[PDB]
Write a protein that binds this ligand. Structure first.
Ligand SMILES: *[B-](O)(O)CCCCCCCC
Lengths: 164, 548
C-alpha cells in the first residue's frame, strides 16, 4: 500500500536503494536492474516461461545453449501453475513483498523507457512482468544443481518400441 | 569459484578478512549484478545478486562478509527402475508393479510462416520424479529406466534464506541462520567478521541416506563413475527422514561439514576435506563430502596460505591478479628438461623456445608459451602413469608432481604429446609473437577488450573460460563479481570489480566501464557508508513512488 524507494548511483552505475519496507526496497531494485538489464531479464523470463519457440522458433537456442523447443518443454514442465502456486504460498510476507516490489519497479521502468539504455525496445517479448515470472526464474535457478543439468535427458525420455 | 576467509590469528590487523572470487557466466540468467540494499534500522547490506532476485547473494554488511562456491555435494539422486517384465511403462517397487504417471505439456512454435502451431510432449514420471535418458548410458529399455529426484524442487526456503543472510550480524549469527533454515541450494558458504572468525559451511540441501543403507542402496558401477545413483526397486532406498532436517528427506544441519577457525578457511570447488589441512573434514556421507585429490586452484591457494606469516588484503588481491598458471609448477620443469634433451628435433623447436621464454602466467603480456602449454596439458591429461610422483593421499598438497621421464614409454609419449600440441598450435593462425592478451578478449559492440586470466583447470586462480570465435577467444565465463573485504574501525572497507560491468546492454554507459578496468586489473572501492557514497563525484539520485 504505497511503493517508494530512494536510489543513489555511485561510479560504474552501482545502485544504493533505500526504502522503509520490503515492497519499497523491491521497487527500487526492479527499477534499477531494469535500467541496466531489461532485455536480459525479458529474455530469461521468456526462457523460464517455456516460450522461446513461440517468439524465436525452433532453430534457436537459449543463453544456456539448449535448443528452444526442448528448453521450452523442460521449463513448461518445471514451472507448471500448481508448482508455482505452492511455491508462492510457502513464501513469507517479507519475501512476497520483495517480489511484488521488484515486479512493480521493473514494470515502471518499462512504461517509461525510451531506448536510452534498452536495445530491445519494441520487441513483443519485452513486456510487463509478474511475481510468477520471478518465481519461474527462482525455480530455474534452484534446479541448476539437479534436474536442470538433465533437461535434455528429461525431454529425450521415451519408452521403447518393438525393437530387438 | 574461489573463496578465502582469514581470521584474527593470521590477518595483518587481527580482524576478519574475506576474498570472494566466484566464477560464473558473463551473460544470461546467472550474470551477477551489483547493488546495495538498506531499510534504515534493520537492513544494510551490499554485494552482488543474480537476475530477478531481490536479495544480495554475495556481499557484506557492517561486521560481516560472506561468499559462496559451488560444492561437490550431490543435490539429487538418480534412481534405477526395474521395469515390469510385461510392460516397460510400469516399474517394480518391492515386487509390486506401479504405473508411470504421464504429464503432457503443450508448446507454441513459431514457424517459417510466422504462424504458431501447438506441439504436445509427454513427460513420464515415477514416484521419484521424471524419467531421464542418456543414450548409451542411462537408457530406457525393456529391463530398466532411470528417474531423477531433485532435492531443491521442494526447497521453498531459498529466497528467505538469503534475505536472512542479508540481515546477519556476525559469523556466529550467519551460521545460526543458515543451519536453522537450510535454504541454500547447492553452494558452500564462507565468511569472516570484524571480530576475526573465519567460517566454512558445507550447508546446503543434500539428499539424506542413513549410513547403513548406503552399501546396498547404491548402484556400484554408476557411483564409481561419479553419479549419485540409487536402487529404485527397493522402498528402503527412499531418502531417509529425520525430524531435525528442515525439509523431508534432506540431511540435518548437524551432519553437514562446518569449520570455524581463526586462522583461515578456503575453497576452490573441491570437497570439504582440505578446507584447512590443519583440521581435515572427514567422516561424512559420500553424498556430502569425499576425500578426493584437490584441483590445482586449491593446491595453489594452500601453497600461499600455509605458514605463520600474516596475510594482508594485498596478498589476497595478488593471488588473483598474478594470473599464475599453477599447473606449470608440476609439469613445466620436467617438460623443459625433455626439450633440452631433444634439441635438433626441429618439430619441437618453436614450442620449446616459446615454453622457455614464458613467464608461466596468463597475463595480457604472457607469451605464446601459455598456448603451447595448454594444448600439451590437454594431451598430458590423457596419458597413463606419466606423473613422476602420482597422487599420494598422505601428501595431498604436494602430489601429483613431475613427469616420469625415467620410464622410456612415458618419455616417448610425452614427447609425442608435445609434438602433437606444437603441430596443432602452429596449424592454427597465431601470428608471430602474439601475446595472450592479443588472443583472449571480450567483445563490446564492435570493439574488443583484452582479458587476463585462463582456465581454472590449469590452476589459474583468476579463472577465465573462453571459446574460439573467428580470429579470437571470446570470454564466456569466469571471474565475475570480485569483493575483497576488511574491517577497519571506520567501517567495512570493500574493494573489487564486476568484470563484465553492470549492464549487458550496449547502449548503457555501464556496458564496458568496469571491463576496461578489469583488463588493467585495477580494482576499485565499493562504497558502503553514506560518507563513502556522498564522496563519489559521479553520485546521482532519484526518488520514485507509485500507488499499490
Ligand atoms: B563458482 O563455484 O564457479 C560459482 C559460484 C557462484 C555462487 C552463486 C550464489 C547464488 C546462487
Amino acid at each position: 500500500t504505497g511503493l517508494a524507494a530512494d536510489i543513489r548511483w555511485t561510479a560504474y552505475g552501482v545502485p544504493h536503494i533505500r526504502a522503509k519496507d520490503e515492497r519499497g526496497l523491491g521497487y527500487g531494485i526492479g527499477y534499477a536492474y531494469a535500467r541496466d538489464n531489461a532485455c536480459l531479464l525479458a529474455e530469461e523470463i521468456v526462457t523460464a516461461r517455456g516460450e522461446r519457440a513461440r517468439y524465436f522458433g525452433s532453430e534457436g537456442k537459449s543463453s544456456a545453449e539448449l535448443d528452444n523447443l526442448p528448453s521450452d518443454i523442460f521449463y513448461a514442465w518445471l514451472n507448471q501453475p500448481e508448482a508455482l502456486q505452492a511455491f508462492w504460498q510457502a513464501q513469507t510476507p517479507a519475501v512476497r513483498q520483495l517480489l511484488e516490489g521488484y515486479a512493480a519497479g521493473f514494470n515502471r521502468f518499462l512504461r517509461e523507457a525510451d531506448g536510452k539504455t534498452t536495445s530491445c525496445l519494441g520487441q513483443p517479448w519485452l513486456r510487463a512482468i509478474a511475481t510468477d515470472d520471478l518465481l519461474r526464474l527462482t525455480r530455474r535457478l534452484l534446479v541448476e544443481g539437479g534436474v536442470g543439468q538433465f533437461a535434455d535427458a528429461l525431454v529425450a525420455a521415451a519408452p521403447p518400441g518393438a525393437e530387438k | 569459484s574461489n573463496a578465502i576467509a582469514v581470521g584474527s590469528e593470521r590477518s595483518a590487523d587481527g580482524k576478519g578478512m574475506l576474498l570472494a572470487n566466484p566464477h560464473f557466466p558473463w551473460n544470461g540468467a546467472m550474470r551477477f549484478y551489483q547493488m546495495h540494499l538498506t531499510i534504515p534500522g534493520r537492513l544494510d547490506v551490499m554485494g552482488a545478486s543474480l537476475p530477478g532476485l531481490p536479495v544480495v547473494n554475495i556481499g557484506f554488511s557492517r561486521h560481516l562478509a560472506w561468499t559462496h562456491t559451488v560444492d561437490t555435494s550431490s543435490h539429487f539422486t538418480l534412481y534405477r527402475l526395474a521395469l515390469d517384465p510385461k510392460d516397460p511403462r510400469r516399474y517394480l517397487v518391492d515386487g509390486r508393479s506401479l504405473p508411470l504417471e504421464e504429464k503432457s505439456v503443450a508448446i507454441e512454435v513459431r514457424g517459417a510462416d510466422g504462424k504458431l502451431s501447438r506441439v504436445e510432449h509427454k513427460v513420464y514420471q515415477s514416484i521419484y520424479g521424471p524419467l531421464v535418458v542418456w543414450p548409451g548410458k542411462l537408457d530406457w529399455n525393456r529391463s530398466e529406466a532411470y528417474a531423477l529426484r531433485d532435492a531443491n524442487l521442494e526447497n521453498t526456503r531459498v529466497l528467505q534464506q538469503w534475505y536472512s543472510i542479508n540481515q546477519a550480524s556476525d559469523v556466529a549469527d550467519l551460521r545460526r541462520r543458515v543451519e536453522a533454515l537450510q535454504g541454500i541450494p547447492w553452494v558452500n558458504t564462507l565468511a569472516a567478521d570484524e571480530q576475526g572468525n573465519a567460517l566454512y559451511m558445507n550447508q546446503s540441501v543434500v539428499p539424506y541416506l542413513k549410513p547403513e543403507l548406503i552399501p546396498a542402496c547404491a548402484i556400484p558401477q554408476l557411483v564409481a563413475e561419479g553419479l549419485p545413483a540409487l536402487q529404485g526397486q527397493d522402498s528402503r532406498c527412499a531418502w531417509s527422514r529425520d525430524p531435525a532436517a528442515a525439509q523431508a528427506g534432506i540431511t540435518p544441519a548437524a551432519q553437514l561439514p562446518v569449520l570455524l577457525r581463526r586462522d583461515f578457511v578456503q575453497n576452490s570447488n573441491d570437497s570439504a576435506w582440505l578446507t584447512n589441512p590443519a583440521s581435515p573434514l572427514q567422516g561424512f556421507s559420500p553424498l556430502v563430502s569425499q576425500e578426493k585429490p584437490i584441483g590445482p586452484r586449491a593446491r595453489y591457494a594452500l601453497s600461499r596460505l600455509q605458514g605463520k606469516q600474516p596475510l594482508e588484503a594485498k596478498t589476497l588481491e595478488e593471488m588473483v591478479t598474478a594470473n599464475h598458471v599453477f599447473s606449470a609448477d608440476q609439469v613445466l620443469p620436467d617438460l623443459l628438461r625433455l626439450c633440452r634433451d631433444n634439441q635438433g628435433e626441429k618439430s619441437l623447436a618453436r614450442a620449446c623456445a616459446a615454453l622457455a621464454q614464458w613467464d608461466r602466467g596468463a597475463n595480457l603480456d604472457s607469451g605464446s608459451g601459455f598456448v603451447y602449454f595448454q594444448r600439451f596439458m590437454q594431451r598430458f591429461a590423457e596419458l597413463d602413469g606419466a606423473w613422476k610422483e602420482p597422487f599420494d593421499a598422505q601428501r595431498p598438497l604436494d602430489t601429483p608432481q613431475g613427469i616420469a621421464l625415467d620410464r622410456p614409454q612415458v618419455a616417448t609419449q610425452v614427447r609425442q604429446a608435445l609434438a602433437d600440441a606444437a603441430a596443432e598450435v602452429e596449424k592454427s593462425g597465431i601470428p608471430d609473437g602474439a601475446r595472450w592478451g592479443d588472443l583472449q578478449v571480450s567483445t563490446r559492440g564492435q570493439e574488443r577488450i583484452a582479458i587476463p586470466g585462463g582456465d581454472g583447470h590449469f590452476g589459474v586462480y583468476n579463472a577465465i573460460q573462453s571459446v574460439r570465435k573467428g580470429d579470437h577467444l571470446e570470454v564466456v565465463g569466469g571471474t565475475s563479481y570480485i569483493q575483497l573485504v576488511t574491517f577497519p574501525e571506520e567501517g567495512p572497507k570493500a574493494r573489487g570489480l564486476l568484470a563484465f560491468s553492470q549492464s549487458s546492454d550496449p547502449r548503457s554507459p555501464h556496458y564496458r566501464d568496469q571491463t576496461e578496468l578489469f583488463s588493467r586489473q585495477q580494482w576499485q572501492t565499493l562504497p558502503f557508508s553514506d560518507r563513502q557514497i556522498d564522496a563519489d563525484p559521479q553520485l546521482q539520485r532519484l526518488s520514485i513512488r507509485e500507488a499499490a
